[PDB]
Design a protein around this ligand. Structure first.
Ligand SMILES: Nc1nc2c(ncn2[C@@H]2O[C@H](COP(=O)(O)OP(=O)(O)OP(=O)(O)O)[C@@H](O)[C@H]2O)c(=O)[nH]1
Ligand SMILES: Nc1nc2c(ncn2[C@@H]2O[C@H](COP(=O)(O)OP(=O)(O)OP(=O)(O)O)[C@@H](O)[C@H]2O)c(=O)[nH]1
Ligand SMILES: [Mg+2]
Ligand SMILES: [Mg+2]
Lengths: 246, 258
């Protein structure tokens, strides 16, 4: 089972830590860095932006995405093709890390997500959500959601048409953008960020939205992300190239 | 007694909150920089305080970011110079608006200093007393803070950036100032929220997992930064501004004037 995830965010925003917390293991890796791991049945490829934010900031991200689409298309056009044996490297989900300023959505993040909306399944997350207290975090979420909806940004939504998963997925959609916290520490057993005044529990829903985000890794949800990638995002790219090739 | 403080940092980095925490008072301003003046009072000692905040700092090219800050600083120097050169001058009836200290807010990334930060502080070193601070330090654990401070100090030293150091010459209190210099860059935490503990008002940031206590030295370096408001330290900041930074500006202008 292949699954490709992209983390877009500024330097030191917590991309690597969240990936480690998500899959409960370390990941060892010039604008993008990708590495493939075999988790035990799941072949995972994690991609992470380098120096992002340091107009054209999103270009290397878009180019990477287009190149994975192109590799798949060329395989699809082959005379002697073997799609089953082919390693799908197309990005199935993009976690867009939003800085916990407590302010509003930055213009760069707005433009970037607008250009990614029809290229990849975009899921916005609030990085280092322990930066913000509970009350102003809900105001910050509402502000972000307001700008996303007003600017008509087509972020990804988990499917709620099937009653078998409607309850889980509707709750997930209500928590978007996910207030995330990552950690490489473990105490008596969960993962925590330990301060002298207290410890943030990653897997505690009263502290952050990590448990909601982790439900993305449910089989039905990963399959939906892959299906939309192939049937919508890839098709958009494919139709464009077929026009060019003629 | 006048004292002018400038806060340089990106949007939402916590400039206004720190100023409120530092002086125990909300500041209401009235567009690259904002400045407002308040009259404060401890017992029977008056203080004419001016706070200055950057606006949208880090949104523009590196040069275009620190340029309005340098221009503001130079402008206060120019106003003082023109008054000093006046025929019918009255230096006592003149409001000295020269910036005495600059708090440069460093984002709590836990990694290194941004390239924009190094260039900015290098441009400000001979214009104003620069004191680097780590903003929102309650978002950094103690092991990561110790390592973060080290890398910051290392890059400042290797780039020959002359940040301000508190005087350790006078017998009392050089002990206090020596400890202050050891804490640079100050790990700062601000808060507009306050509670009453043991009959005293205490500013805190309250999370579901606990509360950060601003005045607690075991939580952040705010108490060390507040020692900048000691009379001897404020006067040293003013003196260096007048005797060193302003004179540097003055000499260049005298040449240009011919
Ligand atoms: N407050 C807070 N700090 C975090 C969190 N997650 C990670 N950090 C810290 O932030 C720093 C950044 O960690 P990384 O995961 O390497 O950030 P990054 O996005 O991978 O940065 P680069 O890949 O180097 O560009 C680390 O020192 C972490 O200890 C979080 O959820 N909350
Ligand atoms: N975690 C944390 N949050 C803080 C701290 N200080 C302020 N904040 C929060 O961060 C947000 C930014 O507050 P401000 O002080 O207005 O930030 P600013 O630098 O003045 O931003 P500008 O609008 O550009 O002036 C506020 O909502 C505060 O609640 C802090 O020390 N730690
Ligand atoms: Mg990383
Ligand atoms: Mg402010």
């Amino acid at each position: 089972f292949v699954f490709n995830i992209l983390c877009v965010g500024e330097t030191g925003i917590g991309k690597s830590t969240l990936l480690e917390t998500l899959f409960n293991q370390k990941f060892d890796f010039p604008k993008l860095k990708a590495v493939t791991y075999d988790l035990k049945k799941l072949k995972l490829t994690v991609v992470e932006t380098c120096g992002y934010g340091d107009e054209n900031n999103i270009k290397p991200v878009v180019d990477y995405i287009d190149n994975q689409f192109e590799n798949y298309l060329q395989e699809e056009l082959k005379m002697k093709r073997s799609m089953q044996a082919f390693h799908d490297t197309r990005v199935h989900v993009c976690l867009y890390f939003i800085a916990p300023t407590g302010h509003s959505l930055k213009s760069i993040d707005l433009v970037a997500m607008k250009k990614l909306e029809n290229k990849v399944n975009v899921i916005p997350v609030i990085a280092k959500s322990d930066t913000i207290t509970k009350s102003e975090l809900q105001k910050f979420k509402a502000r972000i959601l307001s700008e996303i909806q007003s600017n008509e940004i087509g972020i990804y939504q988990f499917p709620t048409d099937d009653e078998a998963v409607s309850e889980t997925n509707s709750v997930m959609n209500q928590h978007i953008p996910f207030a995330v916290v990552g950690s490489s520490e473990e105490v008596k057993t969960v993962r925590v960020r330990q301060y002298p005044w207290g410890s943030v529990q990653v897997e505690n829903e009263n502290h952050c939205d990590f448990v909601r985000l982790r439900e993305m890794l449910l089989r039905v949800n990963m399959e939906d992300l892959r299906e939309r990638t192939h049937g919508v995002h890839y098709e958009t790219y494919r139709r464009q190239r077929l026009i060019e090739m003629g």
